[model samples]
Target chain A: EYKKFVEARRELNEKVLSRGTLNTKRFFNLDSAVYRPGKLDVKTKELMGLVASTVLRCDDCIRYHLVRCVQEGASDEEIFEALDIALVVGGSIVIPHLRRAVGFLEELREMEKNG
Target chain B: YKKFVEARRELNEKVLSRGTLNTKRFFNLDSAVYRPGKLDVKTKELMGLVASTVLRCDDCIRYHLVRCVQEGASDEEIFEALDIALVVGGSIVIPHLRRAVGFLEELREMEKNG
Candidate 1:
Protein backbone atom coordinates (compact mmCIF):
# COMPACT_ATOMS: atom_id res chain seq x y z
CA GLU A 1 0.00 0.00 0.00
CA TYR A 2 2.79 2.43 0.91
CA LYS A 3 4.65 1.47 -2.24
CA LYS A 4 1.59 2.17 -4.38
CA PHE A 5 0.84 5.48 -2.69
CA VAL A 6 4.36 6.90 -2.43
CA GLU A 7 4.40 8.52 -5.85
CA ALA A 8 0.99 10.08 -5.43
CA ARG A 9 1.89 11.38 -1.97
CA ARG A 10 5.08 12.85 -3.37
CA GLU A 11 3.20 14.60 -6.13
CA LEU A 12 0.75 15.97 -3.61
CA ASN A 13 3.64 17.18 -1.49
CA GLU A 14 5.21 19.00 -4.37
CA LYS A 15 1.92 20.50 -5.47
CA VAL A 16 0.79 21.54 -2.02
CA LEU A 17 4.07 22.53 -0.43
CA SER A 18 5.86 23.97 -3.46
CA ARG A 19 4.93 27.45 -2.39
CA GLY A 20 6.93 27.61 0.85
CA THR A 21 9.05 25.74 3.38
CA LEU A 22 7.35 27.35 6.37
CA ASN A 23 3.95 26.18 5.28
CA THR A 24 5.31 22.70 4.66
CA LYS A 25 6.83 22.49 8.10
CA ARG A 26 3.75 23.93 9.73
CA PHE A 27 1.59 21.39 7.96
CA PHE A 28 3.78 18.34 8.63
CA ASN A 29 5.47 18.96 11.95
CA LEU A 30 2.33 18.00 13.84
CA ASP A 31 2.15 14.97 11.58
CA SER A 32 5.61 14.07 12.75
CA ALA A 33 4.67 14.54 16.35
CA VAL A 34 1.37 12.72 16.10
CA TYR A 35 2.71 9.40 14.85
CA ARG A 36 5.50 8.79 17.30
CA PRO A 37 4.92 6.54 20.31
CA GLY A 38 4.25 8.32 23.57
CA LYS A 39 1.81 7.24 26.26
CA LEU A 40 0.31 5.09 23.53
CA ASP A 41 2.40 2.93 21.21
CA VAL A 42 2.91 3.96 17.59
CA LYS A 43 0.53 1.22 16.42
CA THR A 44 -2.24 2.57 18.65
CA LYS A 45 -1.62 6.08 17.43
CA GLU A 46 -1.71 4.92 13.81
CA LEU A 47 -5.01 3.15 14.43
CA MET A 48 -6.45 6.28 16.02
CA GLY A 49 -5.22 8.28 13.05
CA LEU A 50 -6.80 5.75 10.74
CA VAL A 51 -10.13 6.15 12.52
CA ALA A 52 -9.94 9.94 12.32
CA SER A 53 -8.98 9.81 8.65
CA THR A 54 -11.91 7.56 7.92
CA VAL A 55 -14.30 9.79 9.86
CA LEU A 56 -12.89 12.91 8.23
CA ARG A 57 -13.37 11.13 4.89
CA CYS A 58 -9.93 11.84 3.59
CA ASP A 59 -8.86 9.11 1.21
CA ASP A 60 -5.24 10.18 1.24
CA CYS A 61 -5.13 10.39 5.00
CA ILE A 62 -6.86 7.03 5.28
CA ARG A 63 -4.31 5.35 3.05
CA TYR A 64 -1.43 7.08 4.78
CA HIS A 65 -2.53 5.86 8.19
CA LEU A 66 -3.41 2.42 6.84
CA VAL A 67 0.11 2.00 5.53
CA ARG A 68 1.53 3.07 8.86
CA CYS A 69 -0.76 0.71 10.79
CA VAL A 70 0.41 -2.24 8.71
CA GLN A 71 4.06 -1.19 8.87
CA GLU A 72 3.84 -0.92 12.63
CA GLY A 73 2.58 -4.52 12.84
CA ALA A 74 -1.00 -3.77 13.80
CA SER A 75 -3.05 -6.94 13.65
CA ASP A 76 -6.20 -7.28 11.60
CA GLU A 77 -8.10 -7.63 14.86
CA GLU A 78 -6.71 -4.36 16.13
CA ILE A 79 -7.56 -2.64 12.89
CA PHE A 80 -11.11 -3.98 12.97
CA GLU A 81 -11.64 -2.81 16.53
CA ALA A 82 -10.54 0.68 15.58
CA LEU A 83 -12.85 0.60 12.61
CA ASP A 84 -15.72 -0.34 14.91
CA ILE A 85 -15.10 2.81 16.90
CA ALA A 86 -14.93 4.86 13.72
CA LEU A 87 -18.16 3.39 12.42
CA VAL A 88 -19.98 4.10 15.63
CA VAL A 89 -18.66 7.63 15.95
CA GLY A 90 -18.77 8.43 12.24
CA GLY A 91 -22.25 6.90 11.72
CA SER A 92 -23.38 5.36 8.44
CA ILE A 93 -20.94 7.16 6.16
CA VAL A 94 -18.07 5.24 7.71
CA ILE A 95 -19.26 1.97 6.22
CA PRO A 96 -17.71 2.62 2.81
CA HIS A 97 -14.42 3.58 4.33
CA LEU A 98 -14.49 0.41 6.42
CA ARG A 99 -14.97 -1.62 3.26
CA ARG A 100 -11.95 0.05 1.71
CA ALA A 101 -9.94 -0.44 4.87
CA VAL A 102 -10.72 -4.16 4.85
CA GLY A 103 -9.79 -4.33 1.18
CA PHE A 104 -6.46 -2.64 1.86
CA LEU A 105 -5.68 -4.97 4.72
CA GLU A 106 -6.53 -7.98 2.59
CA GLU A 107 -4.31 -6.73 -0.19
CA LEU A 108 -1.55 -6.14 2.31
CA ARG A 109 -1.87 -9.69 3.58
CA GLU A 110 -1.86 -11.13 0.06
CA MET A 111 1.29 -9.25 -0.82
CA GLU A 112 3.04 -10.62 2.23
CA LYS A 113 1.93 -14.16 1.45
CA ASN A 114 3.04 -13.99 -2.19
CA GLY A 115 6.43 -12.58 -1.24
CA TYR B 1 -26.57 30.79 10.24
CA LYS B 2 -26.37 33.67 12.64
CA LYS B 3 -25.51 31.46 15.58
CA PHE B 4 -22.94 29.62 13.51
CA VAL B 5 -21.31 32.81 12.27
CA GLU B 6 -21.21 34.19 15.77
CA ALA B 7 -19.58 30.98 17.02
CA ARG B 8 -17.27 31.03 14.06
CA ARG B 9 -16.29 34.60 14.91
CA GLU B 10 -15.14 33.46 18.34
CA LEU B 11 -12.90 30.89 16.69
CA ASN B 12 -11.63 33.49 14.23
CA GLU B 13 -10.77 35.82 17.06
CA LYS B 14 -8.58 33.16 18.61
CA VAL B 15 -6.85 32.54 15.31
CA LEU B 16 -6.30 36.24 14.74
CA SER B 17 -5.02 36.98 18.23
CA ARG B 18 -2.98 33.79 18.26
CA GLY B 19 -1.78 34.39 14.63
CA THR B 20 -3.01 31.63 12.29
CA LEU B 21 -4.68 30.56 9.04
CA ASN B 22 -8.22 30.83 7.71
CA THR B 23 -10.20 27.90 9.05
CA LYS B 24 -13.55 28.95 7.62
CA ARG B 25 -13.89 25.90 5.46
CA PHE B 26 -12.78 23.59 8.20
CA PHE B 27 -15.20 25.20 10.62
CA ASN B 28 -18.07 25.00 8.17
CA LEU B 29 -17.36 21.39 7.48
CA ASP B 30 -17.11 20.69 11.19
CA SER B 31 -20.45 22.34 11.90
CA ALA B 32 -22.09 19.80 9.65
CA VAL B 33 -19.92 17.00 10.96
CA TYR B 34 -21.10 17.19 14.58
CA ARG B 35 -24.87 17.06 14.16
CA PRO B 36 -26.80 14.28 15.93
CA GLY B 37 -26.28 10.92 14.34
CA LYS B 38 -26.17 7.21 15.16
CA LEU B 39 -23.35 8.28 17.42
CA ASP B 40 -25.28 11.11 19.15
CA VAL B 41 -24.03 14.65 19.64
CA LYS B 42 -21.80 14.02 22.65
CA THR B 43 -19.92 11.19 20.98
CA LYS B 44 -19.48 13.20 17.82
CA GLU B 45 -18.21 16.21 19.70
CA LEU B 46 -15.84 14.10 21.75
CA MET B 47 -14.40 12.45 18.66
CA GLY B 48 -14.02 15.79 16.89
CA LEU B 49 -12.44 17.33 19.96
CA VAL B 50 -9.95 14.50 20.17
CA ALA B 51 -9.08 14.85 16.48
CA SER B 52 -8.66 18.59 16.89
CA THR B 53 -6.18 17.94 19.65
CA VAL B 54 -4.26 15.52 17.45
CA LEU B 55 -4.27 18.01 14.60
CA ARG B 56 -2.94 20.58 17.07
CA CYS B 57 -5.26 23.33 15.96
CA ASP B 58 -5.86 25.69 18.87
CA ASP B 59 -8.77 27.38 17.11
CA CYS B 60 -10.35 24.02 16.51
CA ILE B 61 -9.55 22.99 20.03
CA ARG B 62 -11.31 26.01 21.50
CA TYR B 63 -14.32 25.58 19.23
CA HIS B 64 -14.79 21.95 20.08
CA LEU B 65 -14.24 22.55 23.77
CA VAL B 66 -17.11 25.01 23.87
CA ARG B 67 -19.35 22.67 21.94
CA CYS B 68 -18.51 19.67 24.11
CA VAL B 69 -19.45 21.57 27.24
CA GLN B 70 -22.60 22.87 25.62
CA GLU B 71 -23.50 19.29 24.83
CA GLY B 72 -23.29 18.63 28.58
CA ALA B 73 -20.14 16.59 28.66
CA SER B 74 -18.44 16.79 32.01
CA ASP B 75 -14.85 17.67 32.80
CA GLU B 76 -14.20 14.04 33.67
CA GLU B 77 -15.54 12.93 30.32
CA ILE B 78 -13.59 15.62 28.51
CA PHE B 79 -10.44 14.57 30.32
CA GLU B 80 -11.03 10.99 29.30
CA ALA B 81 -11.44 12.19 25.74
CA LEU B 82 -8.16 14.07 26.05
CA ASP B 83 -6.44 10.92 27.22
CA ILE B 84 -7.10 9.30 23.88
CA ALA B 85 -5.93 12.40 22.02
CA LEU B 86 -2.81 12.81 24.11
CA VAL B 87 -1.79 9.25 23.52
CA VAL B 88 -2.47 9.40 19.81
CA GLY B 89 -0.99 12.85 19.19
CA GLY B 90 1.98 12.63 21.55
CA SER B 91 3.69 15.55 23.27
CA ILE B 92 3.20 18.01 20.43
CA VAL B 93 -0.46 18.28 21.38
CA ILE B 94 0.37 19.41 24.88
CA PRO B 95 0.62 23.07 23.94
CA HIS B 96 -2.77 23.14 22.28
CA LEU B 97 -4.07 21.08 25.18
CA ARG B 98 -3.02 23.84 27.51
CA ARG B 99 -5.40 26.05 25.59
CA ALA B 100 -8.22 23.53 26.04
CA VAL B 101 -7.61 23.41 29.77
CA GLY B 102 -7.50 27.18 29.96
CA PHE B 103 -10.76 27.55 28.09
CA LEU B 104 -12.44 24.99 30.29
CA GLU B 105 -11.16 26.81 33.34
CA GLU B 106 -12.55 30.06 32.03
CA LEU B 107 -15.92 28.46 31.57
CA ARG B 108 -15.81 27.07 35.05
CA GLU B 109 -14.96 30.47 36.41
CA MET B 110 -17.87 32.02 34.56
CA GLU B 111 -20.24 29.44 36.03
CA LYS B 112 -18.91 30.16 39.47
CA ASN B 113 -19.08 33.94 39.13
CA GLY B 114 -22.56 33.89 37.72
Candidate 2:
Protein backbone atom coordinates (compact mmCIF):
# COMPACT_ATOMS: atom_id res chain seq x y z
CA GLU A 1 0.00 0.00 0.00
CA TYR A 2 2.75 2.41 0.94
CA LYS A 3 4.73 1.58 -2.18
CA LYS A 4 1.64 2.09 -4.31
CA PHE A 5 1.02 5.45 -2.71
CA VAL A 6 4.62 6.52 -3.23
CA GLU A 7 4.62 5.50 -6.88
CA ALA A 8 1.30 7.20 -7.60
CA ARG A 9 2.41 10.37 -5.85
CA ARG A 10 5.69 10.38 -7.75
CA GLU A 11 3.93 9.90 -11.08
CA LEU A 12 1.41 12.66 -10.39
CA ASN A 13 4.12 15.00 -9.19
CA GLU A 14 6.04 14.41 -12.41
CA LYS A 15 2.94 15.16 -14.48
CA VAL A 16 2.23 18.30 -12.47
CA LEU A 17 5.79 19.56 -12.65
CA SER A 18 5.94 18.93 -16.34
CA ARG A 19 3.35 21.68 -16.75
CA GLY A 20 6.18 24.02 -15.64
CA THR A 21 3.89 26.68 -14.17
CA LEU A 22 5.94 29.10 -12.09
CA ASN A 23 3.61 29.45 -9.13
CA THR A 24 3.06 25.70 -8.76
CA LYS A 25 6.80 25.11 -8.85
CA ARG A 26 7.44 27.81 -6.28
CA PHE A 27 4.67 26.52 -4.03
CA PHE A 28 6.16 23.05 -4.15
CA ASN A 29 9.57 24.48 -3.38
CA LEU A 30 8.19 26.45 -0.45
CA ASP A 31 6.47 23.38 0.95
CA SER A 32 9.71 21.40 0.98
CA ALA A 33 11.70 24.32 2.38
CA VAL A 34 9.28 24.86 5.23
CA TYR A 35 9.98 21.39 6.66
CA ARG A 36 13.72 21.93 6.65
CA PRO A 37 15.51 22.70 9.91
CA GLY A 38 15.19 26.21 11.28
CA LYS A 39 14.28 27.09 14.85
CA LEU A 40 12.61 23.68 14.91
CA ASP A 41 14.51 20.57 13.78
CA VAL A 42 13.35 18.54 10.77
CA LYS A 43 12.03 15.74 12.98
CA THR A 44 9.84 18.11 14.97
CA LYS A 45 8.64 19.78 11.78
CA GLU A 46 7.69 16.46 10.22
CA LEU A 47 5.80 15.52 13.36
CA MET A 48 3.97 18.81 13.15
CA GLY A 49 3.14 18.06 9.51
CA LEU A 50 1.71 14.74 10.60
CA VAL A 51 -0.49 16.45 13.17
CA ALA A 52 -1.82 18.95 10.64
CA SER A 53 -2.43 16.29 8.04
CA THR A 54 -4.26 14.11 10.51
CA VAL A 55 -6.46 16.94 11.64
CA LEU A 56 -7.19 17.91 8.05
CA ARG A 57 -8.05 14.27 7.31
CA CYS A 58 -5.73 14.10 4.36
CA ASP A 59 -4.48 10.53 4.15
CA ASP A 60 -1.84 11.24 1.54
CA CYS A 61 -0.50 14.14 3.59
CA ILE A 62 -0.47 12.01 6.71
CA ARG A 63 1.44 9.23 4.95
CA TYR A 64 3.91 11.68 3.46
CA HIS A 65 4.70 13.12 6.85
CA LEU A 66 4.80 9.67 8.45
CA VAL A 67 7.45 8.65 5.93
CA ARG A 68 9.40 11.83 6.63
CA CYS A 69 9.08 11.36 10.38
CA VAL A 70 10.50 7.85 10.08
CA GLN A 71 13.35 9.15 7.92
CA GLU A 72 13.95 11.89 10.48
CA GLY A 73 14.27 9.20 13.22
CA ALA A 74 11.15 10.04 15.19
CA SER A 75 10.17 7.22 17.49
CA ASP A 76 6.75 5.57 17.43
CA GLU A 77 6.13 7.08 20.85
CA GLU A 78 6.66 10.60 19.55
CA ILE A 79 4.46 10.06 16.50
CA PHE A 80 1.68 8.51 18.55
CA GLU A 81 1.82 11.35 21.04
CA ALA A 82 1.60 13.86 18.23
CA LEU A 83 -1.39 12.06 16.77
CA ASP A 84 -2.96 12.13 20.21
CA ILE A 85 -2.84 15.90 20.07
CA ALA A 86 -4.53 15.83 16.66
CA LEU A 87 -7.26 13.58 17.97
CA VAL A 88 -8.03 15.89 20.85
CA VAL A 89 -7.92 19.13 18.89
CA GLY A 90 -9.83 17.69 15.96
CA GLY A 91 -12.20 15.79 18.17
CA SER A 92 -13.63 12.35 17.22
CA ILE A 93 -13.85 13.34 13.56
CA VAL A 94 -10.15 12.48 13.37
CA ILE A 95 -10.55 8.90 14.58
CA PRO A 96 -11.00 7.43 11.10
CA HIS A 97 -7.87 9.12 9.83
CA LEU A 98 -6.09 8.12 13.01
CA ARG A 99 -6.84 4.49 12.22
CA ARG A 100 -5.42 4.82 8.74
CA ALA A 101 -2.43 6.75 10.06
CA VAL A 102 -1.64 4.00 12.55
CA GLY A 103 -2.04 1.40 9.85
CA PHE A 104 0.38 3.18 7.55
CA LEU A 105 2.89 3.60 10.35
CA GLU A 106 2.72 -0.11 11.05
CA GLU A 107 3.38 -0.91 7.41
CA LEU A 108 6.29 1.47 7.41
CA ARG A 109 7.78 -0.27 10.41
CA GLU A 110 7.30 -3.65 8.82
CA MET A 111 9.03 -2.61 5.63
CA GLU A 112 11.95 -1.23 7.61
CA LYS A 113 12.26 -4.36 9.72
CA ASN A 114 12.13 -6.77 6.77
CA GLY A 115 14.80 -4.81 4.95
CA TYR B 1 -8.78 37.09 26.67
CA LYS B 2 -10.97 36.65 29.67
CA LYS B 3 -13.94 35.39 27.65
CA PHE B 4 -12.04 32.82 25.68
CA VAL B 5 -10.07 31.62 28.65
CA GLU B 6 -13.02 31.45 30.98
CA ALA B 7 -15.36 29.80 28.49
CA ARG B 8 -12.81 27.21 27.41
CA ARG B 9 -12.03 26.42 31.04
CA GLU B 10 -15.64 26.16 32.09
CA LEU B 11 -16.64 24.05 29.08
CA ASN B 12 -13.67 21.73 29.39
CA GLU B 13 -14.28 21.24 33.08
CA LYS B 14 -17.97 20.60 32.48
CA VAL B 15 -17.33 18.13 29.68
CA LEU B 16 -14.32 16.29 31.04
CA SER B 17 -15.67 15.97 34.54
CA ARG B 18 -18.86 14.43 33.22
CA GLY B 19 -17.20 12.62 30.34
CA THR B 20 -16.55 8.92 30.19
CA LEU B 21 -13.25 7.43 31.37
CA ASN B 22 -12.02 7.20 27.80
CA THR B 23 -12.79 10.85 27.15
CA LYS B 24 -10.97 11.95 30.29
CA ARG B 25 -7.94 9.83 29.42
CA PHE B 26 -7.88 11.18 25.90
CA PHE B 27 -7.91 14.75 27.16
CA ASN B 28 -5.13 13.89 29.62
CA LEU B 29 -3.13 12.40 26.77
CA ASP B 30 -3.55 15.64 24.84
CA SER B 31 -2.09 17.62 27.76
CA ALA B 32 0.75 15.13 28.16
CA VAL B 33 1.66 15.47 24.48
CA TYR B 34 2.41 19.17 24.89
CA ARG B 35 4.74 18.73 27.82
CA PRO B 36 8.49 19.23 27.35
CA GLY B 37 10.09 16.26 25.66
CA LYS B 38 12.24 16.08 22.58
CA LEU B 39 10.21 19.21 21.80
CA ASP B 40 9.67 22.11 24.19
CA VAL B 41 6.29 23.57 25.09
CA LYS B 42 6.86 26.67 22.96
CA THR B 43 7.63 24.65 19.86
CA LYS B 44 4.74 22.27 20.46
CA GLU B 45 2.28 25.10 20.97
CA LEU B 46 3.42 26.78 17.78
CA MET B 47 2.96 23.52 15.91
CA GLY B 48 -0.48 23.21 17.41
CA LEU B 49 -1.27 26.69 16.23
CA VAL B 50 -0.10 25.79 12.74
CA ALA B 51 -2.17 22.62 12.67
CA SER B 52 -5.24 24.37 13.98
CA THR B 53 -4.95 27.05 11.36
CA VAL B 54 -4.56 24.48 8.61
CA LEU B 55 -7.52 22.53 9.90
CA ARG B 56 -9.47 25.78 10.02
CA CYS B 57 -10.66 25.14 13.52
CA ASP B 58 -11.35 28.59 14.89
CA ASP B 59 -11.63 27.65 18.55
CA CYS B 60 -8.63 25.35 18.30
CA ILE B 61 -6.73 28.13 16.61
CA ARG B 62 -7.56 30.54 19.42
CA TYR B 63 -6.68 27.98 22.06
CA HIS B 64 -3.31 27.25 20.54
CA LEU B 65 -2.63 30.92 19.92
CA VAL B 66 -3.13 31.72 23.58
CA ARG B 67 -0.90 28.84 24.54
CA CYS B 68 1.73 29.93 22.02
CA VAL B 69 1.78 33.40 23.54
CA GLN B 70 1.93 32.00 27.07
CA GLU B 71 4.77 29.70 26.06
CA GLY B 72 6.88 32.73 25.08
CA ALA B 73 6.82 32.27 21.32
CA SER B 74 7.92 35.47 19.62
CA ASP B 75 5.51 36.98 17.10
CA GLU B 76 7.94 36.36 14.26
CA GLU B 77 8.29 32.68 15.13
CA ILE B 78 4.56 32.17 15.31
CA PHE B 79 3.99 33.84 11.95
CA GLU B 80 6.80 31.86 10.37
CA ALA B 81 5.17 28.65 11.46
CA LEU B 82 1.86 29.90 10.13
CA ASP B 83 3.57 30.58 6.81
CA ILE B 84 4.53 26.91 6.62
CA ALA B 85 0.94 25.95 7.29
CA LEU B 86 -0.34 28.25 4.58
CA VAL B 87 2.01 26.81 2.00
CA VAL B 88 1.23 23.25 2.90
CA GLY B 89 -2.49 23.79 3.20
CA GLY B 90 -2.76 25.95 0.08
CA SER B 91 -5.13 28.84 -0.69
CA ILE B 92 -8.08 27.28 1.10
CA VAL B 93 -6.41 28.30 4.34
CA ILE B 94 -6.44 32.01 3.49
CA PRO B 95 -9.73 32.71 5.25
CA HIS B 96 -8.48 31.08 8.41
CA LEU B 97 -5.26 33.03 7.99
CA ARG B 98 -7.24 36.25 8.13
CA ARG B 99 -8.90 35.30 11.38
CA ALA B 100 -5.71 33.88 12.89
CA VAL B 101 -4.01 37.23 12.30
CA GLY B 102 -6.98 39.03 13.80
CA PHE B 103 -6.90 36.90 16.94
CA LEU B 104 -3.15 37.32 17.24
CA GLU B 105 -3.70 41.06 17.20
CA GLU B 106 -6.24 40.69 19.96
CA LEU B 107 -3.77 38.66 21.97
CA ARG B 108 -1.11 41.33 21.51
CA GLU B 109 -3.55 44.00 22.65
CA MET B 110 -4.34 42.05 25.79
CA GLU B 111 -0.66 41.73 26.57
CA LYS B 112 -0.15 45.46 26.03
CA ASN B 113 -3.01 46.34 28.37
CA GLY B 114 -1.66 44.07 31.07
Highest-scoring model, DockQ: 1
In Å, residue A66's CA in model 1 sits off its true spot by 1.1
Residue B100, candidate 2: Cα error in Å is: 20
Colliding pairs, model 1: none
lDDT of 1 by residue, A49-106 (tens): 9988987778778888887888899888888888877766554555777788778778
For candidate 2, lDDT tens digit of each residue in A6-105? 9999889978978869888899899889998999999999999998998788999999999999989998999999998787666556788988888889
Off by over 4 Å in 1: B1-114
Alpha-carbon shift of residue B30 in model 2 (angstroms): 37
TM-score of the B chain in each candidate versus the native B chain: 0.75, 0.93
lDDT by residue (tens digit), candidate 1, B62-81: 77887888899999999999
Per-residue CA lDDT of model 2 for B1-114, tens digit only, reads 668888989999999988999999999998888999999999999988888877779889889988999899888998999987776665567788888889889889978888
Off by over 4 Å in 2: B1-114
lDDT for B112 in candidate 2 is 84
> Deviation in angstroms for B23 in model 1?
22
Scored by TM-score, the top model is 2
